Design a protein around this motif. Structure first.
Motif, mmCIF file in Angstrom:
data_model
loop_
_atom_site.group_PDB
_atom_site.id
_atom_site.type_symbol
_atom_site.label_atom_id
_atom_site.label_comp_id
_atom_site.label_asym_id
_atom_site.label_seq_id
_atom_site.Cartn_x
_atom_site.Cartn_y
_atom_site.Cartn_z
ATOM 1 N N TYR A 78 36.124 36.563 23.387
ATOM 2 C CA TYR A 78 36.552 36.388 24.766
ATOM 3 C C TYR A 78 37.047 37.663 25.427
ATOM 4 C CZ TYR A 78 36.497 31.335 23.974
ATOM 5 O OH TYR A 78 36.127 30.046 23.692
ATOM 6 N N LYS A 79 37.064 38.789 24.715
ATOM 7 C CA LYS A 79 37.797 39.934 25.234
ATOM 8 C C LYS A 79 37.087 40.560 26.423
ATOM 9 C CE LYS A 79 38.576 43.799 23.383
ATOM 10 N NZ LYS A 79 38.250 44.682 24.521
ATOM 11 N N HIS A 80 35.754 40.572 26.435
ATOM 12 C CA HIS A 80 35.058 41.114 27.599
ATOM 13 C C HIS A 80 35.314 40.273 28.840
ATOM 14 C CE1 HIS A 80 31.860 43.895 25.555
ATOM 15 N NE2 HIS A 80 33.071 44.416 25.572
ATOM 16 N N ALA A 81 35.255 38.948 28.708
ATOM 17 C CA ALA A 81 35.505 38.088 29.859
ATOM 18 C C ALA A 81 36.917 38.284 30.388
ATOM 19 C CB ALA A 81 35.274 36.631 29.477
ATOM 20 N N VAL A 82 37.903 38.254 29.492
ATOM 21 C CA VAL A 82 39.289 38.405 29.919
ATOM 22 C C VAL A 82 39.517 39.780 30.529
ATOM 23 C CG1 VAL A 82 41.655 38.426 29.139
ATOM 24 C CG2 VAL A 82 40.103 36.705 28.294
ATOM 25 N N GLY A 83 38.969 40.823 29.905
ATOM 26 C CA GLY A 83 39.170 42.166 30.413
ATOM 27 C C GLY A 83 38.543 42.382 31.774
ATOM 28 N N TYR A 84 37.339 41.855 31.983
ATOM 29 C CA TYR A 84 36.694 42.028 33.276
ATOM 30 C C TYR A 84 37.435 41.272 34.367
ATOM 31 C CZ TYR A 84 32.674 44.757 31.933
ATOM 32 O OH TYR A 84 31.852 45.776 31.533
ATOM 33 N N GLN A 85 37.903 40.058 34.071
ATOM 34 C CA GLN A 85 38.668 39.324 35.073
ATOM 35 C C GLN A 85 39.963 40.053 35.414
ATOM 36 O OE1 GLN A 85 37.702 36.859 36.931
ATOM 37 N NE2 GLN A 85 35.719 36.961 35.902
ATOM 38 N N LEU A 86 40.654 40.569 34.398
ATOM 39 C CA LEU A 86 41.865 41.336 34.645
ATOM 40 C C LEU A 86 41.604 42.593 35.458
ATOM 41 C CD1 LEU A 86 44.870 41.607 34.103
ATOM 42 C CD2 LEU A 86 44.322 42.843 32.033
ATOM 43 N N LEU A 87 40.530 43.320 35.155
ATOM 44 C CA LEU A 87 40.179 44.497 35.939
ATOM 45 C C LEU A 87 39.937 44.134 37.393
ATOM 46 C CD1 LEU A 87 39.345 47.390 36.377
ATOM 47 C CD2 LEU A 87 37.125 46.846 35.418
ATOM 48 N N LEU A 88 39.216 43.039 37.638
ATOM 49 C CA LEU A 88 38.986 42.621 39.015
ATOM 50 C C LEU A 88 40.299 42.335 39.723
ATOM 51 C CD1 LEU A 88 35.872 40.309 38.890
ATOM 52 C CD2 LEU A 88 36.032 42.620 39.753
ATOM 53 N N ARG A 89 41.241 41.692 39.034
ATOM 54 C CA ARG A 89 42.502 41.378 39.700
ATOM 55 C C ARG A 89 43.352 42.617 39.953
ATOM 56 N NH1 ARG A 89 43.378 35.930 40.835
ATOM 57 N NH2 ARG A 89 42.979 34.516 39.081
ATOM 58 N N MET A 90 43.332 43.601 39.056
ATOM 59 C CA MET A 90 44.246 44.733 39.169
ATOM 60 C C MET A 90 43.598 45.994 39.726
ATOM 61 S SD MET A 90 44.737 45.863 35.186
ATOM 62 C CE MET A 90 45.602 47.371 35.583
ATOM 63 N N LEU A 91 42.361 45.917 40.221
ATOM 64 C CA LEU A 91 41.758 47.094 40.845
ATOM 65 C C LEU A 91 42.501 47.541 42.097
ATOM 66 C CD1 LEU A 91 37.868 47.197 40.808
ATOM 67 C CD2 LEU A 91 39.540 48.736 39.808
ATOM 68 N N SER A 92 42.983 46.603 42.910
ATOM 69 C CA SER A 92 43.533 46.961 44.214
ATOM 70 C C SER A 92 44.867 47.683 44.129
ATOM 71 C CB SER A 92 43.684 45.716 45.085
ATOM 72 O OG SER A 92 44.600 44.804 44.515
ATOM 73 N N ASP A 93 45.488 47.745 42.953
ATOM 74 C CA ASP A 93 46.709 48.528 42.803
ATOM 75 C C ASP A 93 46.456 49.994 43.109
ATOM 76 O OD1 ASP A 93 48.620 46.699 42.314
ATOM 77 O OD2 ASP A 93 48.809 47.090 40.163
ATOM 78 N N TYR A 94 45.300 50.502 42.701
ATOM 79 C CA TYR A 94 44.934 51.894 42.878
ATOM 80 C C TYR A 94 44.048 52.111 44.092
ATOM 81 C CZ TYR A 94 46.517 51.572 38.103
ATOM 82 O OH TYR A 94 47.248 51.306 36.975
ATOM 83 N N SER A 95 43.866 51.084 44.919
ATOM 84 C CA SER A 95 43.063 51.163 46.134
ATOM 85 C C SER A 95 41.623 51.563 45.819
ATOM 86 C CB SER A 95 43.690 52.123 47.143
ATOM 87 O OG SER A 95 42.738 52.495 48.122
ATOM 88 N N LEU A 96 40.963 50.715 45.039
ATOM 89 C CA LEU A 96 39.577 50.920 44.659
ATOM 90 C C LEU A 96 38.806 49.627 44.859
ATOM 91 C CD1 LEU A 96 40.203 52.952 41.425
ATOM 92 C CD2 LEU A 96 39.494 53.822 43.630
ATOM 93 N N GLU A 97 37.492 49.758 44.992
ATOM 94 C CA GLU A 97 36.628 48.606 45.132
ATOM 95 C C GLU A 97 35.557 48.602 44.054
ATOM 96 O OE1 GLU A 97 38.195 46.362 48.033
ATOM 97 O OE2 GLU A 97 36.011 46.179 48.017
ATOM 98 N N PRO A 98 35.239 47.442 43.494
ATOM 99 C CA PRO A 98 34.265 47.400 42.405
ATOM 100 C C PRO A 98 32.853 47.641 42.904
ATOM 101 C CG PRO A 98 35.312 45.247 42.773
ATOM 102 C CD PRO A 98 35.636 46.100 43.939
ATOM 103 N N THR A 99 32.054 48.208 42.038
ATOM 104 C CA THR A 99 30.638 48.421 42.261
ATOM 105 C C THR A 99 29.862 47.172 41.882
ATOM 106 O OG1 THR A 99 30.439 49.372 40.055
ATOM 107 C CG2 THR A 99 30.890 50.861 41.869
ATOM 108 N N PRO A 100 28.645 47.006 42.403
ATOM 109 C CA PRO A 100 27.891 45.777 42.100
ATOM 110 C C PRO A 100 27.635 45.545 40.620
ATOM 111 C CG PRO A 100 26.570 47.398 43.292
ATOM 112 C CD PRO A 100 27.982 47.802 43.443
ATOM 113 N N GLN A 101 27.418 46.600 39.836
ATOM 114 C CA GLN A 101 27.160 46.396 38.415
ATOM 115 C C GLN A 101 28.377 45.821 37.705
ATOM 116 O OE1 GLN A 101 24.187 46.454 37.232
ATOM 117 N NE2 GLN A 101 25.077 45.585 35.373
ATOM 118 N N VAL A 102 29.574 46.265 38.081
ATOM 119 C CA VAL A 102 30.783 45.716 37.478
ATOM 120 C C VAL A 102 30.908 44.235 37.799
ATOM 121 C CG1 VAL A 102 33.279 45.822 37.491
ATOM 122 C CG2 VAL A 102 31.960 47.912 37.404
ATOM 123 N N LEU A 103 30.613 43.855 39.039
ATOM 124 C CA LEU A 103 30.662 42.446 39.407
ATOM 125 C C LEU A 103 29.655 41.635 38.607
ATOM 126 C CD1 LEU A 103 30.934 42.996 43.216
ATOM 127 C CD2 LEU A 103 32.702 42.037 41.783
#
Lengths: 150, 51
Positions: A78-103
């Motif tokens: 489950y670590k990839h799923a959990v890590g990707y969801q966490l990254l999506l939630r905490m990206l905006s702390d650093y004022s960044l937007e995800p790229t389509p491949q990450v999504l």
């Protein structure tokens, strides 16, 4: 399990996957970004008890604080799923937007997680529905008409 | 062994159970049929209180 996921490993994975703190992009890591990440992970896991359901996360017992060195209790599947969801939630702390491949990666991992927890409840008979004479409700079984409850 | 002496009574009781056992599931159908056709609420017996 194999090597045991700690709560700090998951946040380090999320920080590395977008080139914020890793040894293979430039350099560096901060200590406050770790406490913030671990608390975000705890709140996410608390929320996930509703929509995706329980997946075996190990919460902190009593108040104290999570701490990155604690054992998460999650299987390594489950670590990839959990890590990707966490990254999506905490990206905006650093004022960044995800790229389509990450999504796309996040969606694929989430779908893999969803596939492993299906139920398909398989609705039952009603309770006023007769059971036929063909299966001998008098002698073999009892109670003509389905129970449909329990 | 007879009359007041009840050794006849055990034989009578044993004969009753021997006669009752084979014809046990046959007569249940007869009773169910009569009750199904005549008693006013008998066509739903088995469910009755279901919800």
């Amino acid at each position: 399990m194999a090597t045991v996921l700690t709560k700090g490993e998951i946040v380090l994975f999320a920080l590395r996957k977008f080139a914020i703190a890793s040894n293979a992009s430039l350099t560096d890591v901060e200590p406050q970004s770790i406490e913030d990440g671990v608390n975000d992970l705890e709140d996410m896991m608390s929320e996930w008890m509703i929509n995706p359901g329980d997946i075996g996360y190990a919460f902190a017992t009593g108040d104290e604080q999570p701490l990155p060195d604690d054992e998460s209790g999650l299987p390594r599947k489950y670590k990839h799923a959990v890590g990707y969801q966490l990254l999506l939630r905490m990206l905006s702390d650093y004022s960044l937007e995800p790229t389509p491949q990450v999504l796309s990666n996040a969606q694929r991992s989430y779908d893999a997680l969803m596939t492993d927890t299906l139920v398909v409840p398989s609705m039952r008979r009603r309770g006023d529905f007769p059971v036929g004479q063909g299966n001998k409700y008098d002698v073999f079984t009892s109670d003509r008409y389905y129970p449909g409850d329990l | 062994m007879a009359e007041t002496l009840e050794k006849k009574h055990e034989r009578i009781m044993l004969r009753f159970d021997r006669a009752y056992s084979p014809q046990k599931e046959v007569r249940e159908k007869c009773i169910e049929a009569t009750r199904f056709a005549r008693v006013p609420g008998g066509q739903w017996e088995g469910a009755t209180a279901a919800g």
